Swiss-Prot record, chains A, B:
Coiled-coil intervals: none
Domains (record comment): The core domain contains the D-x(n)-D-x(35)-E motif, named for the phylogenetically conserved glutamic acid and aspartic acid residues and the invariant 35 amino acid spacing between the second and third acidic residues. Each acidic residue of the D,D(35)E motif is independently essential for the 3'-processing and strand transfer activities of purified integrase protein.
Residue ranges annotated for the Integrase catalytic domain, each copy included: 1-146
Function: Catalyzes viral DNA integration into the host chromosome, by performing a series of DNA cutting and joining reactions. This recombination event is an essential step in the viral replication cycle. Has a strong preference for using the 3'-OH at the viral DNA end as a nucleophile.
Positions annotated to bind Mg(2+) 3: 11, 68, 104
Domain of life: Viruses
Span of the entire protein shown here: 1334 to 1479 of 1603
Assembly and interaction partners: Homodimer; further associates as a homooctamer.
Species assigned in the record: Rous sarcoma virus subgroup C (strain Prague)
Cofactor note: Binds 8 Mg(2+) ions per integrase homotetramer. Zn(2+) can also be a cofactor for the nicking activity, but not for the polynucleotidyltransferase activity.
Residue ranges of the TM segments: none
Name of the protein described by the UniProt record: Integrase
Cofactor(s) of this protein: Mg(2+); Mn(2+)
Amino acid sequence: GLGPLQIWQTDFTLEPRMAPRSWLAVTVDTASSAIVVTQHGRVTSVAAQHHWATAIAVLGRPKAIKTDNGSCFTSKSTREWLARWGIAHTTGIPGNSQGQAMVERANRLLKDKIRVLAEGDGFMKRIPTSKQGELLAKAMYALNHF
Amino acid sequence: GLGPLQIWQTDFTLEPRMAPRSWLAVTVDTASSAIVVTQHGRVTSVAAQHHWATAIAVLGRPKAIKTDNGSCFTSKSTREWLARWGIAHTTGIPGNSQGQAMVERANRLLKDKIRVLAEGDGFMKRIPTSKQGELLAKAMYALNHF
Ligand SMILES: CC(=O)Nc1cc(S(=O)(=O)O)cc2cc(S(=O)(=O)O)cc(O)c12
Ligand SMILES: CC(=O)Nc1cc(S(=O)(=O)O)cc2cc(S(=O)(=O)O)cc(O)c12
Ligand SMILES: [Mn+2]
Ligand SMILES: [Mn+2]
């Protein structure tokens, strides 16, 4: 059968409404356009690995993951975690090309959706910590399943 | 098109290897046989709701969820959370029938898989807390994607 390769794009984006764990790791599966998001307190190699561990459970094992050159992505620790799994790690193409547009678009939509849902629940600033998990899951659902 | 109805079965099972959060919530989608599992410190109405919030993000919104008559499932809080989402909540059929066999089978396979992976990593008893999340995600992946 002919179809798209299982290649992911992953990035981190800061969302203060979700503080203290305001670092959102976002993965777009370019083959299905599915979006997986998890929240973290810091942008470390270990946060990137925990995110992908969750994404693999949800989406399955990809052939390759495209990131920018953030240190959590280029560290020895992360290089070794990806090798343990047999996942190729790659980056942006030259030729005046940018990092990864699909995942940057997803960052924006995600942040828009979080704001819309939070304000509907009456949270004009930071979402109360005990409400964050379900609101994030509701944002992911809306971005994925119609 | 003709296919199966989107009906889930959900249950809790105790797994001391995953302590202090040793309560595993397990949902089987009867339509795809997909399995979603999350871990919790206690079996409360709020734990059940956080699990389903995650399952909805992963699997989409089901038409109905079958549980046994555990109190976390039959409380007012949980009845109201399911109504907010528009999800029917149902239970086992009479006629000498048991609770929900598919989800009970999944409970067993999950616990077998956790044990196999833990012992391979050298953990004969409780899995160190910082290792639990990725090991659980690896168990879910193996039970789902081949
Ligand atoms: C590997 C990878 O990331 N590939 C890709 C990245 C991006 S981008 O928008 O993120 O730049 C867009 C892509 C578009 C297509 S196509 O079906 O429209 O032809 C195919 C790709 O393979 C793409
Ligand atoms: C709603 C629901 O749970 N339905 C079901 C529960 C169980 S059980 O094993 O869990 O008892 C088995 C089922 C088997 C089938 S079939 O395709 O083989 O005919 C269909 C169902 O709909 C089933
Ligand atoms: Mn980045
Ligand atoms: Mn039970």
